[PDB]
Each structure stands twice: as C-alpha cells, then as structure tokens.
Design a protein around this nucleic acid. Structure first.
Length: 436
RNA sequence: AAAAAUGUGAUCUUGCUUGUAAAUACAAUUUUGAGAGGUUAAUAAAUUACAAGUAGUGCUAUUUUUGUAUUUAGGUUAGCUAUUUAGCUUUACGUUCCAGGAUGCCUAGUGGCAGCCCCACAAUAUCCAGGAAGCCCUCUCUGCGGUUAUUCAGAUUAGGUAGUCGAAAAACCUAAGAAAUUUACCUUAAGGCUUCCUCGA
C-alpha cells in the first residue's frame, strides 16, 4: 500500500493491455501464463514439460515448432526465478505479426499487483488481458470476517484474489463444573460476562474495519454460527456507521477455511447488488434535484471538459465503454488547427474526417481518448471520478442526451454547450493550436 | 693350599631346609596398521654372610708345621633327534631374539697336535631353563571403510520421475564383507493412396 507507486503499476498494466490486444498470433503460437503467489514453481515447470511432450505427439511439423518454441521460451524465464515472489508473476510468450510483414518476438515477465490464485495458462491465437483488467476495476476489494466459537479469522477478497490478514482465538467457559456448586446461576452471570466479551470482540473487529478515520473495503461481510454474528451485528459500539453496509449474514458450521469460504461466495453476489442500489440512492437524489429545476447538473461531452476547468464539479461520472474520444484536426488551409469530439462512426473514417450534413474539412494526425485523460487528471481539477454502467434505466437516460460522460456541481453553474445544456459557446478550436 | 696337636666332652665349621640383604643385556621377529590404556594375568632362581634345626657336624670352637703357589685355567646348566652310525638348538616351554650364574663333574694325563686347559678321552647330572621383545582386549587417527539427514547441480536418458553414479554435505565412527548391481516406470489423439480406346509417310 504505497501512494503513487500503485498508480505507476496501473499505468504499465493499461499500456500492456492495449499492446497485447493489438497483436494477433496465427494458430496456437500465442501463450499466456499467470503464476499466483505461494504456488510452487516445480508443479508449473512439470506442467510445462508435460505440455512439451504433447506437442511432439501432434506431428504437425509446422504447428509443433511454434508450440514448442512458445513452451521453451516461457520455461527459460521461469528458470530464472527459484521461488515465486509475493502477488505472483505474469509472463507472456509467443510469436506475433507486425506492420510490413515483420516478425516480432515477445518475452515479458513482471510482478503483478494484488493478483492471487489466478492459475491461468492458455493456448490460443491471442493473449488474454482479462486478468489484467480485474486489477483495473473501480470497486475497492471485499472485507470478510469469519466467526466461530473456537476462534476468529480475518481476511479480504478482491476479484478472484484471496487474502488473509490476521486471526486469533478465545475460549468460552466450556466446562460447567459438576463437582463445585454455586447452584444459583452464577454461570448465567458468567455467560452474561461472556456476552460482553463477544460484544467487545465485535467492537475490536469493527476497529479493524476502520483505520485513519477511513474504511479499508467498500463492502464488509461477517459470518458465524449459533447466531453469534446476528447478535454481533447489532450493538451501539459495533456498528461504527458500517452496520448499514453489511448485506448478508450467513449461517455456517465447522468454520475454518471450510464452510466459512462458502459464506463469502454468497455474500459477494449480494454485495454487487448493494452497489446497484447505492447507485439507485444517488439516482433518487438526482431526480429530486431535477424536481427542484436548479439546473445545477450539466450535460454534453464538451461541457464536461469545460466543467472540470472551472473546478466547480464535485462529482465526475464516466462509463468504461466510452464512445467519445479527443481528436486533433488540420484545416485544408493549414493555417488553422481544430478540436472536436467524435462518435465511433466518425472516428472510424480517419482519412476523410468529414460530416455529411455540412461538408466540414478535417484531417486527423493524433488522437487521445477521453476516458484515460479524465482518470489521470481528475485530482488537479478537484473533481471525484466515478465509473458507472448503462445497465440501469438512469444510465440509459444519460446515453439518450448527455452521452458517455456525466457531471455533478458543488454549486449551481450555467456552464457552456447546447442551450438546454448551458451557454451557446459549445465548441472551440483553441486546444489544437497549443499542441502544434 | 697340605701335615704337629692341648683344647672348647675326642670333633666339623653346615652340599640341606627355614627367616634377613644383592647378580642373573637391550633390541629385533610377532603382536592393535599405528599411538600403546592392560606390553593385562600370574608370579619367578641362585651364589656369598648370620641364627635355628639338624641333612652336616658334638653348638660354641683352638694350635704347630708345610706350601711363591696345588693358584689353575677351560668348559657343563648341552639339548633334541636316529635302529645304528650319527645327526644336531645362540635356550623356548603364544610367537620370537638373547644370559646363561650354582652345584658337581670332565679336560689337568693319555692318542693327534709344536704346544695346550685345544680335538678325542670331551665330562654326570644339573637349581632357574632366566631376561628381553609381544597386551588373544579398551580410547584416539579411523586399518577394514564405511556409514549417514541431505542439498543437489550435475552425470546418465529420446526426454521425464525415481533409482544408480557424482558433487557440495548435518552428523556419526571403529576393529580388516575384503563387498555389487544390469534399474525400472512413464508419453505419444487422428499419418499420406488416380487410369483411360491411334496400330503417329
């Protein structure tokens, strides 16, 4: 957990994904390997050796060469490291085709950030970036509490990554005491005392959840048996404003990386559901503002860039599937530089770059996507960047008018764009000139 | 050394046994491979002096004379072996090397030899046959050499895993196996397939 250092890793990952997708390999020449942490190398190596034997049996005399080369290449890199480093390793090997019929060979190994037990090895015509994108996802990990009579274990789950933080054990007074009699329910009193310790333990677990007056995980899930967790969940000290956040309580038996794991799996599907309703709560708030007719909320692709420059927008909303990117255009005269936002249809015809309705003359030299730009620069703007999907009806509503981007203002501002959107000076060509 | 003899009762000074004092090479060969603790154990003779007993002698014990001088010297501690002739150990009797002292006897001559104490006649037993080196067994180096946790990293294999071999090796040690190899098992998803009627200036 290091500031900015994590971001650098993210940068390399996104760059890698774009390059991996661009390159296409014929046949079975493309090999992708992901090695999880605390996973023995020898099992992996043996698996690679077994794969090598299979290729020989193929008898292709063409395909076999390509398959053997890929296998041998990955093995050489594997040989260099005696024991696997924490957070695992990712290795890509194979043969790819580049511009002008040139052959390009690739050997990349690096230490991935926070990927546990991916166990992915595939033979295919292209590299798989799905594991890489998991790291990139907006949600911030899952926090799990597994509670049992004989002990308590704490850990976190991110994507398909399993983490164990810390565990401890306490004991309830199990032996009643046949020989000594108090006869009166001193034991009940003892139980009551036990009850307070269970409460305190709850209180301590909660303390773990929040550090630095902040919460470690977006969602926290607790599990247990004999209703210790249900009781555990509702108490004044235990909630710490986090009680509302927890969705499912799951009854478990024989907990100890057994049955306890099952509780985690069911809770996660629901936790994803809370995000859907969390967005909905935002939505209800959004509609109330609409009723108000303040006009504080803005819309339009160009409006958002302008909104950030102003710095008046508290919340920035973007979609992963963004159909709008930033393109720089050269005038026929060559004396003037032009900036415009283009739809995928417009983006595809790079050489003409002309709108049918007006006959506009545009030439495209270099393009910079808006999604990557907004995420990198939101901090200087002061706005908060949030990512949402169009699955929700409200998301669809944004699509009909505003588009792939959304914006929220701290204070009511008229802004610029279409007349419904704001001021009439919707577009400008000033930015292109600075670059050139 | 041989001889008057009062004597001490005429007599002798005790080879014997008993108690006291001191002689009777070291090293090598074997044996622990070595150094070496256990050279473990056990337990050995004789010559001279004193007392007792007495085997001796009467304990103690005395005189004259003779003799340069009877001084000797040499050797024995001979053994074993063979029917006989004769052969023939530095003495082992764990193994092995080396003393050999006492008694008394034979060489004081005779034959050979210049001569002799030499060879023969060499001579009878004969106390100890002693001393020395060597610990059939315990620790160290480990003499068999081994025997090990293993890491390997390799070798060897078509290659893999194991074994074997090698290597870096935790450790341990132990009374000369005089040691031996055949070593396996694992994996191959589809492999490529045609013959019709000139007998052409």
């Amino acid at each position: 957990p290091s500031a900015a250092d994590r971001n650098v890793e993210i940068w390399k990952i996104k760059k890698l994904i774009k390059s991996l997708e661009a390159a296409r390999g014929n046949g079975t020449s493309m090999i992708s390997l992901i090695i999880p942490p605390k996973d023995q190398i020898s099992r992996v190596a043996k698996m690679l050796a077994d794969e090598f034997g299979t290729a020989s049996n193929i008898k292709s005399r063409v395909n076999r060469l390509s398959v053997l080369g890929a296998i041998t290449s990955v093995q050489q890199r594997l040989k260099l490291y005696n024991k696997v480093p924490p957070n695992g390793l990712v290795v890509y090997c194979g043969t790819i085709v580049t511009e002008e019929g040139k052959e390009k060979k690739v050997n990349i190994d690096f230490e991935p950030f926070k990927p546990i037990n991916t166990s992915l090895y595939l033979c295919d015509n292209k590299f798989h970036t799905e594991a890489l994108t998991a790291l990139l996802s907006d949600d911030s990990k899952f926090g799990f509490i597994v509670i049992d009579g004989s002990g308590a274990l704490f850990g976190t789950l991110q994507g398909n990554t399993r983490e164990v933080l810390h565990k401890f054990t306490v004991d309830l007074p199990k032996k009643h005491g046949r020989g000594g009699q108090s006869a009166l329910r001193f034991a009940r009193l003892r139980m009551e005392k036990r009850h307070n310790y269970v409460r305190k333990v709850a209180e301590t677990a909660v303390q773990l959840f929040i550090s630095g007056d902040k919460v470690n995980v977006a969602g926290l899930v607790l599990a247990g048996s004999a209703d210790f967790k249900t009781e555990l969940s509702q108490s004044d000290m235990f909630d710490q404003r986090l009680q509302s956040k927890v969705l499912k309580l799951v009854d478990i038996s024989y907990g100890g990386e057994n049955g306890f794991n099952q509780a985690i799996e069911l809770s996660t599907e629901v936790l994803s559901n809370v995000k859907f309703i969390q967005e909905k709560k935002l939505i209800g708030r959004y509609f109330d503002e609409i009723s108000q007719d303040t006009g504080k909320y803005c819309f339009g692709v160009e409006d958002t860039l302008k909104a950030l420059e102003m710095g008046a927008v508290e919340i920035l909303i973007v979609y992963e599937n963004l159909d709008i990117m930033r393109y720089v255009l050269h005038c026929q005269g060559t004396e003037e530089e032009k900036i415009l936002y283009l739809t995928p249809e417009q983006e595809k015809d790079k050489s003409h770059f002309t709108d049918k309705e007006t006959g506009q003359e545009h030439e495209l030299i270099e393009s910079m996507p808006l999604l990557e730009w907004f995420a990198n620069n939101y901090k200087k703007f002061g706005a908060t960047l949030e990512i949402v999907t169009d699955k929700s009806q409200e998301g669809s509503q944004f699509v009909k008018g505003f588009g792939g981007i959304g914006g929220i203002l701290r204070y009511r501002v008229d802004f610029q764009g279409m007349e419904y959107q704001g001021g009439d000076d919707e577009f400008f060509d000033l930015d292109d000139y600075l670059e050139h």
